Motif scaffolding. Structure first.
Motif, PDB file in Angstrom:
ATOM      1  N   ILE A 293      -8.718  -6.180   0.723  1.00 52.75           N
ATOM      2  CA  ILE A 293      -8.281  -5.971   2.093  1.00 52.75           C
ATOM      3  C   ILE A 293      -9.488  -6.176   2.979  1.00 52.75           C
ATOM      4  CG2 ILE A 293      -7.396  -4.340   3.801  1.00 52.75           C
ATOM      5  CD1 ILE A 293      -5.930  -2.984   1.428  1.00 52.75           C
TER       6      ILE A 293
ATOM      7  N   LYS B 197      -2.932   3.373  -0.153  1.00 49.64           N
ATOM      8  CA  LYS B 197      -3.870   2.548  -0.902  1.00 49.64           C
ATOM      9  C   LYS B 197      -3.161   1.384  -1.564  1.00 49.64           C
ATOM     10  CE  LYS B 197      -7.368   5.973  -1.340  1.00 49.64           C
ATOM     11  NZ  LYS B 197      -7.460   6.701  -2.628  1.00 49.64           N
ATOM     12  N   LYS B 198      -3.827   0.230  -1.530  1.00 51.22           N
ATOM     13  CA  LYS B 198      -3.357  -0.988  -2.183  1.00 51.22           C
ATOM     14  C   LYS B 198      -2.898  -0.704  -3.612  1.00 51.22           C
ATOM     15  CE  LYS B 198      -8.131  -2.060  -3.407  1.00 51.22           C
ATOM     16  NZ  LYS B 198      -9.333  -2.677  -2.836  1.00 51.22           N
TER      17      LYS B 198
ATOM     18  N   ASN C 250      -7.917   4.690   2.769  1.00 49.58           N
ATOM     19  CA  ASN C 250      -6.513   4.589   3.109  1.00 49.58           C
ATOM     20  C   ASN C 250      -6.411   3.702   4.330  1.00 49.58           C
ATOM     21  OD1 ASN C 250      -5.315   6.444   1.112  1.00 49.58           O
ATOM     22  ND2 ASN C 250      -6.334   8.056   2.316  1.00 49.58           N
TER      23      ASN C 250
ATOM     24  N   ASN D 276       0.845  -1.179   0.000  1.00 48.51           N
ATOM     25  CA  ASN D 276       0.000   0.000   0.000  1.00 48.51           C
ATOM     26  C   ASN D 276       0.884   1.233   0.000  1.00 48.51           C
ATOM     27  OD1 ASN D 276      -2.778  -1.416   1.100  1.00 48.51           O
ATOM     28  ND2 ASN D 276      -0.921  -2.285   2.044  1.00 48.51           N
TER      29      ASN D 276
ATOM     30  N   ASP E 140      -6.632  -5.952  -5.463  1.00 51.19           N
ATOM     31  CA  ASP E 140      -6.289  -6.230  -4.074  1.00 51.19           C
ATOM     32  C   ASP E 140      -7.549  -6.182  -3.229  1.00 51.19           C
ATOM     33  OD1 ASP E 140      -3.532  -6.778  -3.978  1.00 51.19           O
ATOM     34  OD2 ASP E 140      -3.014  -4.651  -4.120  1.00 51.19           O
TER      35      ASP E 140
ATOM     36  N   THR F 128      -5.685 -10.187   3.522  1.00 55.29           N
ATOM     37  CA  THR F 128      -5.688  -9.723   2.145  1.00 55.29           C
ATOM     38  C   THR F 128      -5.505 -10.871   1.167  1.00 55.29           C
ATOM     39  OG1 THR F 128      -4.860  -8.036   0.623  1.00 55.29           O
ATOM     40  CG2 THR F 128      -3.226  -9.294   1.942  1.00 55.29           C
TER      41      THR F 128
END
Ligand SMILES: Nc1ncnc2c1ncn2[C@@H]1O[C@H](COS(=O)(=O)NC(=O)c2ccccc2O)[C@@H](O)[C@H]1O
Length: 507
Positions: free
Chosen positions: A371, A363-364, A430, A346, A369, A391
């Motif tokens: 999460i 952010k990924k 985030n 991230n 992705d 994840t």
């Protein structure tokens, strides 16, 4: 190609349906690490890829030396899909040995410089490696054979033991290439085959199998969010064997866009300041303890650090006040990076307000992705709820290599990797890492790993256990499926047996 054998050797692959999606949505591409290098040499031949002291490699030279060293390796009997342990400090010949392995399809196993022979020995057995390659910054260091002489039991299958001493020129560091005519080296591996093993971040390290396609994907995404270009000059202070230094965005990201990596064996403040001023470095990746070293160096005022643009900080908890201090003192955009060698990374964004970069880990990398912030019972939590970060995505592993018993506990039923981290997703999506799921317990001056005790307790009929500390004392919450727990534990370290113990929920 070889995925059939690998699965039988411990590899856990991506589920067929998820893999197809990562193909069709344009995440996984069709380049191996070495084919990517061949194309970088195609586009950026005469650009400088790497600089270290009076030594440097263009993309063209890196490709040649790699080809020349792969040919050497092949001649010494190293073969495709073989695992070779790689241990190296921040020296320029490391890049020749990595792509030399990729050139013949061998698979590196990246070992931090610093792991003793106790670690190397377990790593070598668990991976069934055939080779150990140890790069040394000087001749007074321990050679590969020296380390292997310290094993507690012989390892006959690890027959390739070679040390490179980094010297004042590349040519002198690699004398074994003199008697070797470079080959036309053909590797049969596909981009979805295993490229390498990383090590996780407690005790004996676990092996992390990453494919070419999934790792190159994460690198391409990190290249975008770090904003790397062919004019990027990046200072490398972290250890080159570490996932953060390699790919987040790391030296591979710099290679990906044709930039220049500047390699420092030292993290000492004055040395790095000199290099930043000398090469007009624009980016560097740090961990908070290096940032603290730097912001408190009195040498700070003594160098032109104006070229600096972006500082990545990741690897451990970054206090907001220290993030704030990094922006102010260095006058850079802070980029926080919450990553793990197992996959997910991230980033905060370059157009994020300073506050976002101060308070969150961004952010990924991929829109694919996933999460999950799980409560104590596995259920997903909403925004701004602290819980266990799990994840799964297009570059996150589905099992540790050749570790079936650990795998059953480290991944959910539906395949989410359990990071062991706690935190939340905020309003902007985030992520904010607040801590660890199971911190080590400090009982009467000794430190104990809760997962280490859960594992033994899972072999009792145990269906769920979570070990925590109250009062300093060790408590074991059990889910069904005291004297007998401890008795069974003594059956298999006394200072670790629980001091109190069986509920239905809250694991
Ligand atoms: N910004 C952060 N704030 C708080 N904690 C952090 C953290 N970044 C990691 N962690 C902790 O470190 C574990 C991973 O450890 S790692 O395999 O060495 N890989 C890395 O650090 C790593 C860092 C950057 C990019 C790629 C990487 O691979 C994580 O689970 C978490 O516990």
């Amino acid at each position: 190609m070889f995925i059939e054998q690998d699965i039988q050797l411990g590899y856990v692959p991506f589920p067929k349906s998820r893999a197809q999606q990562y193909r069709d949505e344009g995440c996984w591409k069709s380049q191996t690490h070495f084919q990517l290098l061949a194309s970088l040499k195609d586009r950026f031949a005469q650009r400088v890829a790497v600089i270290q002291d009076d030594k440097q490699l263009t993309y063209q030279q890196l490709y040649d030396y790699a080809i020349h060293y792969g040919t050497y390796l092949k001649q010494q009997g190293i073969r495709e899909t073989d695992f070779v342990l790689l241990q190296s400090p921040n020296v320029i010949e490391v890049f020749i040995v990595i792509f030399g392995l990729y050139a013949i399809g061998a698979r590196p196993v990246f070992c931090l410089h610093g792991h003793g022979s106790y670690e190397i020995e377990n790593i070598a057995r668990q991976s069934r490696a055939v080779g150990f390659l140890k790069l040394c910054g000087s001749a007074n260091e321990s050679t590969a054979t020296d380390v292997c002489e310290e094993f507690s039991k012989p390892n006959f299958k690890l027959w390739f033991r070679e040390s490179i001493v980094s010297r004042s020129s590349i040519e002198a560091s690699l004398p074994q290439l003199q008697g070797v005519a470079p080959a036309n080296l053909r590797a049969q591996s596909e981009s979805e085959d295993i490229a390498f093993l990383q090590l996780s971040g407690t005790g004996l390290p676990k092996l992390i199998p990453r494919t070419h396609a999934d790792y190159i994907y994460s690198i391409e995404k990190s290249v975008d969010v770090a904003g790397l270009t062919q004019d990027t000059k990046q200072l490398v202070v972290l250890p080159v064997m570490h996932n953060f230094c390699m790919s987040s965005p790391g030296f591979l990201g710099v290679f990906y866009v044709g930039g220049t990596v500047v390699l420092s064996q030292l993290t000492h403040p004055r040395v790095c300041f000199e290099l930043i001023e000398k090469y007009q470095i624009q980016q560097v990746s740090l961990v908070p303890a290096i940032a603290t070293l730097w912001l408190n160096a009195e040498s700070l005022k003594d160098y032109d650090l104006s070229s600096l643009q972006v500082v990545q900080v990741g690897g451990a908890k970054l206090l907001p006040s220290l993030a704030e201090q990094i922006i102010d003192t260095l006058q850079v955009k802070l980029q926080q990076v919450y990553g793990m060698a197992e996959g997910l990374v991230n980033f905060t964004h370059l157009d994020d307000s300073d506050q976002i970069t101060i308070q969150t880990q961004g952010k990924k990398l991929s829109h694919l992705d996933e999460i999950r912030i799980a409560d104590q019972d596995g259920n997903a939590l909403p925004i701004n709820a602290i819980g266990h970060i799990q994840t799964r995505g297009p570059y996150t592993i589905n099992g540790y290599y050749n570790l079936p018993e650990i795998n059953q506990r480290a991944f959910t039923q539906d395949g989410f990797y359990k990071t062991g981290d706690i935190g939340y997703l905020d309003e902007n999506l985030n992520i904010v890492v607040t801590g660890r799921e199971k911190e080590q317990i400090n009982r009467s001056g000794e430190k104990i790993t809760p997962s280490e005790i859960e594992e033994f307790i899972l072999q009792y009929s145990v269906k769920d256990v979570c070990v925590i500390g109250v009062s300093e004392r060790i408590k074991a919450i059990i889910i069904p499926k005291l004297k007998n727990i401890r008795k069974f534990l003594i059956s298999k370290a006394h200072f670790k047996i629980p001091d109190e113990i069986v509920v239905a929920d809250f694991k």
